């Protein structure tokens, strides 16, 4: 029961969340028996694992007039949250607001179902070092290593293509389109050019949007490989 | 021509001994096999198409006692001195010319060849280090030979520092063994097989 | 052969030369690190002090025991040196390492710079002679297949009777 | 201000691999005459320490008594002992290292022979704060990943241009001589599909952190420097 | 390669340096 929630949270991708002119990175896994949430702002990480009993206790106090079982409440919350996390610029009927009191983040979500109000607050405390490491550090290092291997493969392919082009150049003819001439690929020169020209913009994490938009499949694959 | 321990056999003498052992083994196992001996890096030269620094000591012909004696004339220190005097040593060379000379020697013969093999006895992991065009020419010639149907193998000899195949010879050999990408601090194990004389006639 | 380089870079005639002295290796006399830069008419020296050395090392994220000579030599090899001359001060920017380094230099007194200039000239002549001599000396002066018979498996050597 | 310079120096320094008696760690140390700052990790937890001259002198007196040295000399000797190990490993060190993981804290003991005499030091590294841990590991890693993705995209564009040039050569009444030197068209989707199932399992294995220090340190240093310059 | 020489050229540091230029050529020491 509890372990399934942790595995689901681990096997989930990061999503961008907008609230009150602020940004967050959220990973949520919701099942009928509870849910797990991990929210980061590139400076701190908060985690919350919740079971059905506490779900009912908190829901009955947040929505006094709501008479629902924990499973139905969790299903409704998942149906409300997943569409927003999956993509933006959609019919977002839910409003989010995050606040820090002392060391724990309270994330309040307010929406309307069938036109009636619906509130839910995540009281996520600071994530433990082990959870933060397992969820961010090791997957990121694996992604970096995989990308370096991809760069090496691309360099080898470029070398082979350059060898073929040189074969044509040394024994062959001249291109009808002289504009297509390509310079030989040198790894050191390319790396130097990249570092001095485009690294400042390439390494601009910003508010976390590029991390979510650009590379998430690689993160999921690395996490899955780590699990196995 | 340098001995590291001052007591072990020099690479050239050991290569000559291996060639002699192969000749003796062939004289019994199969009298209808063709063997040739070519030296590259010498001052003198003699080839059908006349490149430079390539000496073809013996063309492709059936083994015989005369060839064994010719090899024996360079057996030891006196043999090494005679070889240096008659041929010379320590000159620049390009592998492309050597490989093309070997191809010409292979093409010269008329008897149908079941196998075409080349043996490279050297202790230079990176021959064309300063130059780069020569290395590329060597790779192209090796690829052409491999596509033609000629199998090239290297018997690396003692290296005072260390012999590495990943530098230049990785793409030169026909087929790479399962575990041959490491650095070899000792002579190739195939040398023992070559020196192991076999006295028995085998029929196809 | 202390590291040094001449500016401006290119085929144009030189107009400035910079070098570093100090941090001598071994157990002999050791002097504080310093930089001497001359146009052949005026000389600028760091005039560093141990507190100045510590402040400079800590400013650029460099440990106190760290040696700056390798970085200076590497930058000189890469020709990543830039200069900005003021009325009486000079600023040197080095980009040979991962992080840029800034150095401040002040004009050396003439009476003290002249012996320094003479020593620099003598040293340069000695290095020229040594390197010319060195250049003159160096520039010119299937598994289980028999290898012998392909197509036949290599028969194992005849052992004979080997009692267990 | 001295603490600020120590923090900046620690941020600038790259990760290094340290081999203790039984385990391994990733460490970054910055030592100046005013003190030092150290950050160690084992890919599961991060510990940080930062000490000033007074603490250094007290610790030196309490650990190795009968030694009367100013804190600056002790810090210089510690740097001389540590920096060579971090720069390169598997070399003559004669400096034993050990770690004790006490409750919610770590003690890193280093023993050496200073001119033939004992020299002991202990780093009392407490759990690193989330802010420092994030700034030192998470954001730089994300920046490195983004930079590598940009590099991959650039290489793909270069491959596409080379493929276009090859197509032009082929269509310009040409005839390839060496058929073996024949590169197939490059497709991003096919290459990614092949990679994710052929090389990702072996290319995403961090292990003990040795590949990270051996491969992705220059990029890490550049990203950290860029972040520092930005803010 | 303008010729030049130093005295002493041995291990002792050189004292004087001699050269020639512009073959109004004058030997400069």
Swiss-Prot record, chain A:
Effect of residue 65 to E: Abolished ability to repair double-strand breaks (DSBs). Abolished interaction with XRCC4. Abolished ability to participate in V(D)J recombination
Record note on what altering residue 196 to A does: Does not affect ability to repair double-strand breaks (DSBs). Does not affect interaction with XRCC4
Effect noted on mutating residue 65 to G: Does not affect ability to participate in V(D)J recombination
Site (Leu-lock): 116
Additional information: Was named 'Cernunnos' after the enigmatic Celtic god of hunting, the underworld and fertility.
Involvement in disease: Immunodeficiency 124, severe combined: A form of severe combined immunodeficiency (SCID), a genetically and clinically heterogeneous group of rare congenital disorders characterized by impairment of both humoral and cell-mediated immunity, leukopenia and low or absent antibody levels. Patients with SCID present in infancy with recurrent, persistent infections by opportunistic organisms. The common characteristic of all types of SCID is absence of T-cell-mediated cellular immunity due to a defect in T- cell development.
Protein name in UniProt: Non-homologous end-joining factor 1
Native source organism of the sequence: Homo sapiens
Residues of the full protein shown: 1 to 227 of 299
Swiss-Prot record, chain B:
Modified residues (Phosphoserine): 3
Record PTM: Phosphorylation by PRKDC may enhance helicase activity. Phosphorylation of Ser-3 does not affect DNA repair. ADP-ribosylated by PARP3.
Description of what induces expression: In osteoblasts, by FGF2.
Subcellular location per the Swiss-Prot or TrEMBL entry: Nucleus; Chromosome; Cytoplasm
Effect the entry attributes to changing residue 116 to A: Abolishes adduct formation
Taxonomic superkingdom: Eukaryota
Consequence the record notes for mutating residue 112 to A: Abolishes adduct formation
Other notes: Individuals with systemic lupus erythematosus (SLE) and related disorders produce extremely large amounts of autoantibodies to XRCC5 and XRCC6. Existence of a major autoantigenic epitope or epitopes on the C-terminal 190 amino acids of XRCC6 containing the leucine repeat. The majority of autoantibodies to XRCC6 in most sera from patients with SLE seem to be reactive with this region.
Record-stated family: Belongs to the ku70 family.
Function per UniProt: Single-stranded DNA-dependent ATP-dependent helicase that plays a key role in DNA non-homologous end joining (NHEJ) by recruiting DNA-PK to DNA. Required for double-strand break repair and V(D)J recombination. Also has a role in chromosome translocation. Has a role in chromosome translocation. The DNA helicase II complex binds preferentially to fork-like ends of double-stranded DNA in a cell cycle-dependent manner. It works in the 3'-5' direction.
Quaternary structure and partners: Forms a heterodimer with XRCC5/Ku80; heterodimerization stabilizes XRCC5 protein. Component of the core long-range non-homologous end joining (NHEJ) complex (also named DNA-PK complex) composed of PRKDC, LIG4, XRCC4, XRCC6/Ku70, XRCC5/Ku86 and NHEJ1/XLF. Additional component of the NHEJ complex includes PAXX. Following autophosphorylation, PRKDC dissociates from DNA, leading to formation of the short-range NHEJ complex, composed of LIG4, XRCC4, XRCC6/Ku70, XRCC5/Ku86 and NHEJ1/XLF.
Protein's name according to its UniProt entry: X-ray repair cross-complementing protein 6
Organism: Homo sapiens
UniProtKB/Swiss-Prot annotation, chain E:
PTM (free text): Phosphorylation may inhibit interaction with the DNA-bound XRCC5/Ku80 and XRCC6/Ku70 heterodimer (Ku complex).
Domain notes: The N-terminus (residues 1-113) forms a head domain that is structurally related to those of XRCC4, XLF/NHEJ1, and SASS6.
Family statement drawn from the similarity comment of this UniProt entry: Belongs to the XRCC4-XLF family. PAXX subfamily.
Subcellular location: Nucleus; Chromosome; Cytoplasm
Protein name as it appears in the record: Protein PAXX
Protein encoded by which gene: PAXX
Role noted for this protein: Non-essential DNA repair protein involved in DNA non-homologous end joining (NHEJ); participates in double-strand break (DSB) repair and V(D)J recombination. May act as a scaffold required for accumulation of the Ku heterodimer, composed of XRCC5/Ku80 and XRCC6/Ku70, at double-strand break sites and promote the assembly and/or stability of the NHEJ machinery. Involved in NHEJ by promoting the ligation of blunt-ended DNA ends. Together with NHEJ1/XLF, collaborates with DNA polymerase lambda (POLL) to promote joining of non-cohesive DNA ends.
Quaternary structure and partners: Homodimer. Interacts with the DNA-bound XRCC5/Ku80 and XRCC6/Ku70 heterodimer (Ku complex); the interaction is direct. Associated component of the non-homologous end joining (NHEJ) complex, composed of the core proteins PRKDC, LIG4, XRCC4, XRCC6/Ku70, XRCC5/Ku86 and NHEJ1/XLF. Interacts with POLL (DNA polymerase lambda); promoting POLL recruitment to double-strand breaks (DSBs) and stimulation of the end-filling activity of POLL.
């Amino acid at each position: 029961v509890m372990e399934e929630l942790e595995q689901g949270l681990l096997m989930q991708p990061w999503a961008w969340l907008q609230l009150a002119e602020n940004s967050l990175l959220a990973k949520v896994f919701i099942t009928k028996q509870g849910y797990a949430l991990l929210v980061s702002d590139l400076q701190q990480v908060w985690h919350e694992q919740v079971d059905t009993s506490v779900v009912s206790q908190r829901a009955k106090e947040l929505n006094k007039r709501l008479t629902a079982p924990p499973a139905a409440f969790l299903c409704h919350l998942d149906n409300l949250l997943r569409p927003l996390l999956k993509d933006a610029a959609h019919p977002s009927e839910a409003t989010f607001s995050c606040d820090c009191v002392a060391d724990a983040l309270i994330l309040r979500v307010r929406s309307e179902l069938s036109g009636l109000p619906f509130y839910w607050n995540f009281h996520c405390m600071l994530a433990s070092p082990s959870l933060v490491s397992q969820h961010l550090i090791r997957p990121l290092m694996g992604m970096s290593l995989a990308l370096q291997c991809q760069v090496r493969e691309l360099a080898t392919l470029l070398h082979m293509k350059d060898l073929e082009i040189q074969d044509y150049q040394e024994s062959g003819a001249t291109l009808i389109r002289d504009r297509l001439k390509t310079e030989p690929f040198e790894e050191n020169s390319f790396l130097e050019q990249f570092m001095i020209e485009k690294l400042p913009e390439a390494c601009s994490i910003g508010d976390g949007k590029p991390f979510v938009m650009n590379l998430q499949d690689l993160y999921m694959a690395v996490t899955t490989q780590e699990v196995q | 021509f340098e001995s590291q321990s001052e007591d072990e056999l020099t690479p050239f003498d050991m290569s000559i001994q291996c060639i002699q052992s192969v000749y003796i083994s062939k004289i019994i196992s199969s009298d209808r096999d063709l063997l040739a001996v070519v030296f590259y890096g010498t001052e003198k030269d003699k080839n059908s198409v006349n490149f430079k620094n390539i000496y073809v000591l013996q063309e492709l012909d059936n083994p015989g006692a005369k060839r064994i004696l010719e090899l024996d004339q360079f057996k030891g220190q006196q043999g090494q001195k005679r070889f240096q005097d008659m041929m010379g040593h320590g000159s620049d060379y390009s592998l492309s010319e050597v490989l093309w000379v070997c191809a010409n020697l292979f093409s010269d013969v008329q008897f149908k060849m079941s196998h075409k093999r080349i043996m490279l006895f050297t202790n230079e992991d990176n021959p064309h280090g300063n130059d780069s065009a020569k290395a590329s020419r060597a790779r192209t010639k090796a690829g052409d030979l491999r596509d033609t149907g000629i199998f090239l193998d290297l018997m690396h000899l003692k290296k005072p520092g260390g012999f590495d195949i990943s530098l230049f010879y990785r793409d030169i050999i026909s087929i790479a063994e399962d575990e041959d990408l490491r650095v070899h601090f000792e002579e190739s194990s195939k040398l023992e097989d070559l020196l192991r004389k076999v006295r028995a006639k085998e029929t196809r | 052969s202390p590291p040094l380089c001449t500016l401006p870079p290119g085929p144009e005639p030189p107009r400035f030369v910079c070098y570093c002295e100090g941090e001598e290796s071994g157990e002999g006399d050791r002097g504080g690190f310093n930089l001497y830069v001359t146009d052949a008419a005026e000389l600028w020296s760091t005039c560093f002090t141990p507190d100045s050395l510590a402040a400079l090392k800590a400013r650029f994220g460099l440990s106190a025991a760290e040696d700056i000579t390798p970085r200076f030599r590497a930058a000189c090899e890469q020709q990543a040196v830039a200069l900005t001359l003021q009325e009486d001060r000079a600023s040197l920017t080095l980009s040979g390492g991962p992080s840029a380094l800034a150095f401040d230099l002040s004009k050396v007194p003439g009476p003290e710079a002249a012996p320094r200039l003479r020593a620099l000239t003598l040293g340069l002549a000695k290095r020229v002679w040594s390197l010319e001599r060195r250049l003159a000396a160096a520039e010119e002066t299937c598994p289980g297949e028999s290898l012998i018979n392909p197509g036949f498996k290599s028969k194992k050597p005849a052992g004979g009777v080997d009692f267990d």
